Design an enzyme around this catalytic site. Structure first.
Site, PDB file in Angstrom:
ATOM      1  N   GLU A 268      -2.455  -2.776  -1.789  1.00 42.30           N
ATOM      2  CA  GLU A 268      -1.620  -3.569  -0.886  1.00 42.30           C
ATOM      3  C   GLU A 268      -0.521  -2.721  -0.239  1.00 42.30           C
ATOM      4  O   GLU A 268       0.669  -3.026  -0.308  1.00 42.30           O
ATOM      5  CB  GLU A 268      -1.024  -4.750  -1.641  1.00 42.30           C
ATOM      6  CG  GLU A 268      -0.143  -4.357  -2.821  1.00 42.30           C
ATOM      7  CD  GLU A 268      -0.933  -4.149  -4.104  1.00 42.30           C
ATOM      8  OE1 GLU A 268      -2.180  -4.050  -4.037  1.00 42.30           O
ATOM      9  OE2 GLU A 268      -0.306  -4.072  -5.182  1.00 42.30           O
ATOM     10  N   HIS A 292      -6.887 -11.042  -0.912  1.00 45.99           N
ATOM     11  CA  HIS A 292      -6.006 -10.616  -1.993  1.00 45.99           C
ATOM     12  C   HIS A 292      -4.940  -9.658  -1.478  1.00 45.99           C
ATOM     13  O   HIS A 292      -3.737  -9.906  -1.628  1.00 45.99           O
ATOM     14  CB  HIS A 292      -6.825  -9.963  -3.108  1.00 45.99           C
ATOM     15  CG  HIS A 292      -6.014  -9.565  -4.301  1.00 45.99           C
ATOM     16  ND1 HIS A 292      -5.874 -10.372  -5.409  1.00 45.99           N
ATOM     17  CD2 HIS A 292      -5.297  -8.445  -4.559  1.00 45.99           C
ATOM     18  CE1 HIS A 292      -5.109  -9.766  -6.299  1.00 45.99           C
ATOM     19  NE2 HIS A 292      -4.743  -8.596  -5.806  1.00 45.99           N
ATOM     20  N   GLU A 293      -5.371  -8.554  -0.862  1.00 42.24           N
ATOM     21  CA  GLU A 293      -4.422  -7.575  -0.339  1.00 42.24           C
ATOM     22  C   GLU A 293      -3.468  -8.210   0.666  1.00 42.24           C
ATOM     23  O   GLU A 293      -2.291  -7.838   0.734  1.00 42.24           O
ATOM     24  CB  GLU A 293      -5.177  -6.405   0.293  1.00 42.24           C
ATOM     25  CG  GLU A 293      -6.211  -5.780  -0.633  1.00 42.24           C
ATOM     26  CD  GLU A 293      -5.621  -5.357  -1.962  1.00 42.24           C
ATOM     27  OE1 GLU A 293      -4.435  -4.968  -1.985  1.00 42.24           O
ATOM     28  OE2 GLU A 293      -6.334  -5.423  -2.988  1.00 42.24           O
ATOM     29  N   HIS A 296      -0.663 -10.034  -1.094  1.00 39.28           N
ATOM     30  CA  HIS A 296       0.334  -9.118  -1.633  1.00 39.28           C
ATOM     31  C   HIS A 296       1.487  -8.886  -0.666  1.00 39.28           C
ATOM     32  O   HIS A 296       2.577  -8.500  -1.104  1.00 39.28           O
ATOM     33  CB  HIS A 296      -0.319  -7.783  -1.995  1.00 39.28           C
ATOM     34  CG  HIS A 296      -0.861  -7.729  -3.391  1.00 39.28           C
ATOM     35  ND1 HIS A 296      -0.052  -7.776  -4.506  1.00 39.28           N
ATOM     36  CD2 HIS A 296      -2.129  -7.616  -3.851  1.00 39.28           C
ATOM     37  CE1 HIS A 296      -0.799  -7.703  -5.594  1.00 39.28           C
ATOM     38  NE2 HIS A 296      -2.064  -7.605  -5.225  1.00 39.28           N
ATOM     39  N   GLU A 315       0.144  -9.455  -9.351  1.00 34.05           N
ATOM     40  CA  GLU A 315      -1.239  -9.894  -9.206  1.00 34.05           C
ATOM     41  C   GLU A 315      -1.400 -11.362  -9.572  1.00 34.05           C
ATOM     42  O   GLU A 315      -2.238 -12.057  -8.983  1.00 34.05           O
ATOM     43  CB  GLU A 315      -2.167  -9.024 -10.056  1.00 34.05           C
ATOM     44  CG  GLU A 315      -2.110  -7.534  -9.746  1.00 34.05           C
ATOM     45  CD  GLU A 315      -2.483  -7.199  -8.308  1.00 34.05           C
ATOM     46  OE1 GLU A 315      -3.060  -8.059  -7.614  1.00 34.05           O
ATOM     47  OE2 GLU A 315      -2.205  -6.063  -7.867  1.00 34.05           O
ATOM     48  N   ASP A 372      -1.818   3.593 -16.091  1.00 32.70           N
ATOM     49  CA  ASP A 372      -3.220   3.571 -15.683  1.00 32.70           C
ATOM     50  C   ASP A 372      -4.122   3.142 -16.829  1.00 32.70           C
ATOM     51  O   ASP A 372      -5.160   2.507 -16.600  1.00 32.70           O
ATOM     52  CB  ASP A 372      -3.649   4.939 -15.153  1.00 32.70           C
ATOM     53  CG  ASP A 372      -3.125   5.218 -13.759  1.00 32.70           C
ATOM     54  OD1 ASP A 372      -2.942   4.256 -12.986  1.00 32.70           O
ATOM     55  OD2 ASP A 372      -2.903   6.402 -13.429  1.00 32.70           O
ATOM     56  N   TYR A 380      -4.386 -10.128 -13.925  1.00 33.52           N
ATOM     57  CA  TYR A 380      -4.902 -10.913 -12.811  1.00 33.52           C
ATOM     58  C   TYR A 380      -5.257 -12.323 -13.266  1.00 33.52           C
ATOM     59  O   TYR A 380      -4.672 -13.309 -12.803  1.00 33.52           O
ATOM     60  CB  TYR A 380      -6.125 -10.219 -12.205  1.00 33.52           C
ATOM     61  CG  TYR A 380      -5.813  -9.011 -11.353  1.00 33.52           C
ATOM     62  CD1 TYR A 380      -5.474  -7.794 -11.935  1.00 33.52           C
ATOM     63  CD2 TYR A 380      -5.870  -9.078  -9.965  1.00 33.52           C
ATOM     64  CE1 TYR A 380      -5.191  -6.681 -11.159  1.00 33.52           C
ATOM     65  CE2 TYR A 380      -5.591  -7.969  -9.180  1.00 33.52           C
ATOM     66  CZ  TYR A 380      -5.253  -6.772  -9.782  1.00 33.52           C
ATOM     67  OH  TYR A 380      -4.972  -5.666  -9.008  1.00 33.52           O
TER      68      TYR A 380
HETATM   69  N1  VI7 Z   1      -2.269  -7.579 -19.403  1.00 34.43           N
HETATM   70  C1  VI7 Z   1      -1.346  -6.762 -18.637  1.00 34.43           C
HETATM   71  C2  VI7 Z   1      -1.637  -5.554 -18.013  1.00 34.43           C
HETATM   72  C3  VI7 Z   1      -0.487  -5.126 -17.399  1.00 34.43           C
HETATM   73  C4  VI7 Z   1      -0.304  -3.841 -16.591  1.00 34.43           C
HETATM   74  C5  VI7 Z   1       0.979  -3.421 -16.286  1.00 34.43           C
HETATM   75  C6  VI7 Z   1       1.174  -2.261 -15.559  1.00 34.43           C
HETATM   76  C7  VI7 Z   1       0.093  -1.512 -15.127  1.00 34.43           C
HETATM   77  O1  VI7 Z   1       0.347  -0.338 -14.402  1.00 34.43           O
HETATM   78  C8  VI7 Z   1      -0.510  -0.149 -13.306  1.00 34.43           C
HETATM   79  C9  VI7 Z   1      -0.538  -1.033 -12.237  1.00 34.43           C
HETATM   80  C10 VI7 Z   1      -1.392  -0.803 -11.170  1.00 34.43           C
HETATM   81  C11 VI7 Z   1      -2.211   0.315 -11.161  1.00 34.43           C
HETATM   82 CL1  VI7 Z   1      -3.312   0.615  -9.790  1.00 34.43          CL
HETATM   83  C12 VI7 Z   1      -2.183   1.200 -12.220  1.00 34.43           C
HETATM   84  C13 VI7 Z   1      -1.331   0.968 -13.287  1.00 34.43           C
HETATM   85  C14 VI7 Z   1      -1.195  -1.925 -15.439  1.00 34.43           C
HETATM   86  C15 VI7 Z   1      -1.393  -3.091 -16.167  1.00 34.43           C
HETATM   87  N2  VI7 Z   1       0.442  -6.018 -17.642  1.00 34.43           N
HETATM   88  N3  VI7 Z   1      -0.059  -7.038 -18.399  1.00 34.43           N
HETATM   89 ZN    ZN Z   2      -3.760  -6.619  -6.428  1.00 34.74          ZN
END
Ligand code: VI7
Ligand code: ZN
EC number: 3.3.2.6
Length: 606
Positions: A268, A292-293, A296, A315, A372, A380
């Site tokens: 996004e 979706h995007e 955002h 998300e 990551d 989501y």
């Molecule tokens: N069940 C959950 C998962 C999370 C979560 C939180 C932060 C994150 O960092 C990112 C965000 C986007 C990208 Cl592209 C890469 C890393 C990933 C996931 N929060 N609650």
């Molecule tokens: Zn997204």
């Protein structure tokens, strides 16, 4: 408060603006230039500050035309190296200075992938694209790599005159480079304050096609015309998004279809959404990713999470808006279909992660955790499940949509936490506070596994998928001769995909079933990557050696981690392809996306 940044918190100072002057060198795979950061102090007697950097080379730091003392600390793994800067003056509260940092990125920059000409469609020119979320902007330039600070920015990028440069900002002009006749300079201006993770750059032989009053579609000439068609309804979706969340404040909404190695379905980025080329299914069935995007642009880019522990706010609300956009275009029955399908995905994530895995909690603690590694569809679907449950609990989509629009206007251009969201929910729904107190907030927000309550889903469009998938799962030999292509006569691409997802859960199926399924349905000939992805997973999980080469090709012909990672892990789990899967990875590892290549390696334990 942000455990993922090594820089001064927003309570010490904030970056107001970023002026980026830089040049892309495909020969060495580096960006070299300067990053002028207008920084405002948040405390009295501020004499130094710290920025985030990762694998950057710093030449000097100039402040008011004089070089100043700086220091780079020891690297901290994925977080990078902190960069302290000694100010030439002591700043009182709200005073500002401009810091000019001469830097140069590393060819191993985790935010960029450098593509050789053969790695592109045209096969003649190189290619560069960025992916900063969550904490990769620090691998491009020094900054407070944290979503808690929002800044405008302006850029001038010098590139070989044969190529085009685009950014997450309004195009502000192009001219031949005055110091190099073989290059052009592209100027960009982003007047809306953003978190630095929404900064994006792309350089390549890009062509454009206008599909709307404020929308151009970008890609290599081989795919531009296909993409303009696949996304013809963007403007249609923008006006629906505007009706739900208020005005679109970013001016332009362009679309960029990248080469197959793009790690995600979409990004996004303001003014220029990045999307995987795997959405080009030919029938627009996968265009919900565009919805979706687009969403955002309000939830995430306008109202932003303060830290990455609250990523679900981005998300979670974005999925909610998206499925309302699709519901306005295809009926409430379709909206419940996606919601139910999403609840099924949430079951899959929990089963794969584990019912107690810390990454299934809605609000996470990424302290000493590479964001990551935590990325999944759980925020989501689990986020959406909460909002859908609240929508039903609070009196329907009309009432709750009124809250979402107010929520967006309340925190526009700001960064909030889950408590900020919850607090305003109780403020907005002050008449129904007693209904909110019925919610198990501790379980929804901080407990792992599936939510404590399942929303009410309309089964209309899903019933057809359940009947057929049940026939295959519970079918014996004497039932296989009666399966026929007519079983799919009245099934849509989505229903076809859901059927496979429903069958995929109870895998493996007997080998004869899978062989018969290919005979009667011919899933091998379907281009839809969502459908093909699941059909292949069903084959490999059922131990069908004929699908091995077809899966290795899809896992490596595209780089969308949604597909590449599970396919590899499944090939590694199949005894007949474990060796071929590992060996394949080792070969492609050198030319994979840096983030994607690191994750598959962890999945494969290499
Ligand atoms: N069940 C959950 C998962 C999370 C979560 C939180 C932060 C994150 O960092 C990112 C965000 C986007 C990208 Cl592209 C890469 C890393 C990933 C996931 N929060 N609650
Ligand atoms: Zn997204």
């Amino acid at each position: 408060v942000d455990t993922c940044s090594l820089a001064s918190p927003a309570s010490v100072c904030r970056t107001k603006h970023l002026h980026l002057r830089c040049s892309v060198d495909f020969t060495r795979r580096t960006l070299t230039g300067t990053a002028a950061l207008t920084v405002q102090s948040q405390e009295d007697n501020l004499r130094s500050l710290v920025l985030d950097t990762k694998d950057l080379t710093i030449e000097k730091v100039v402040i008011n035309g004089q070089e100043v003392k700086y220091a780079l600390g020891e690297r901290q793994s994925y977080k990078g190296s902190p960069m302290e800067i000694s100010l030439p003056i002591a700043l009182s509260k709200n005073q500002e200075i401009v810091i000019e940092i001469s830097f140069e990125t590393s060819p191993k920059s985790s935010a960029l992938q450098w593509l050789t000409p053969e790695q592109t469609s045209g096969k003649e020119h190189p290619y560069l694209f960025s992916q900063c979320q969550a904490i990769h902007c620090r691998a491009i330039l020094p900054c407070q790599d944290t979503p808690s600070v929002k800044l405008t920015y302006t850029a001038e990028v010098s590139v070989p005159k044969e190529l085009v440069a685009l950014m997450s900002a309004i195009r502000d002009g192009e001219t031949p480079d005055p110091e190099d006749p073989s290059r052009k300079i592209y100027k960009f201006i982003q007047k809306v304050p953003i978190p630095c993770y929404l900064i994006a750059l792309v350089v390549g032989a890009l062509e454009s096609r206008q599909i709307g009053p404020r929308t151009l579609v970008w890609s290599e000439k081989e795919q531009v015309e296909k993409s303009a068609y696949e996304f013809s309804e963007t403007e249609s979706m923008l006006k629906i998004a505007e009706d739900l969340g208020g005005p679109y404040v970013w001016g332009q909404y362009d679309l960029l279809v990248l080469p197959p190695s793009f790690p995600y379905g979409g990004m996004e980025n303001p003014c220029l959404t990045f999307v995987t080329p795997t959405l080009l299914a030919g029938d627009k069935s996968l265009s919900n990713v565009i919805a979706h995007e687009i969403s955002h642009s309000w939830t995430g880019n306008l109202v932003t999470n303060k830290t990455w522990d609250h990523f679900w706010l981005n998300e979670g609300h974005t999925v909610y808006l998206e499925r309302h956009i699709c519901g306005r275009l295809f009926g409430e029955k379709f909206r419940h279909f996606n919601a139910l399908g999403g609840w099924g995905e949430l079951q899959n994530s929990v089963k794969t992660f584990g019912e107690t895995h810390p990454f299934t909690k809605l609000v996470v603690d990424l302290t000493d955790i590479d964001p990551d590694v935590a990325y999944s569809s759980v925020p989501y679907e689990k986020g959406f499940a909460l909002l859908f449950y609240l929508e039903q609990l609070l009196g329907g989509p009309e009432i709750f949509l009124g809250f979402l629009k107010a929520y967006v206007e309340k925190f526009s251009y700001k960064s909030i936490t889950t408590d900020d969201w919850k607090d305003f929910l109780y403020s907005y729904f002050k008449d129904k506070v007693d209904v909110l107190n019925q919610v198990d907030w501790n379980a929804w927000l901080y407990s792992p596994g599936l939510p404590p309550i399942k929303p009410n889903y309309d089964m209309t469009l899903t019933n057809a998928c359940i009947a057929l998938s049940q026939r295959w799962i519970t079918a014996k030999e004497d039932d296989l001769n009666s399966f026929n292509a007519t079983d799919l006569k009245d099934l849509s691409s989505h229903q076809l995909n859901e059927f496979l997802a429903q069958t995929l859960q109870r895998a493996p199926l007997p080998l004869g079933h899978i062989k018969r399924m290919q005979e009667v349905y011919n899933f091998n000939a379907i281009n839809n990557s969502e459908i093909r992805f699941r059909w292949l997973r069903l084959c490999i999980q059922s131990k069908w050696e004929d699908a091995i080469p077809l899966a290795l090709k899809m896992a490596t012909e595209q780089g969308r981690m949604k597909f590449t990672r599970p396919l590899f892990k499944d090939l590694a789990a199949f005894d007949k392809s474990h060796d071929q899967a590992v060996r394949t990875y080792q070969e492609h590892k050198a030319s994979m996306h840096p983030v994607t290549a690191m994750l598959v390696g962890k999945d494969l334990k290499v």
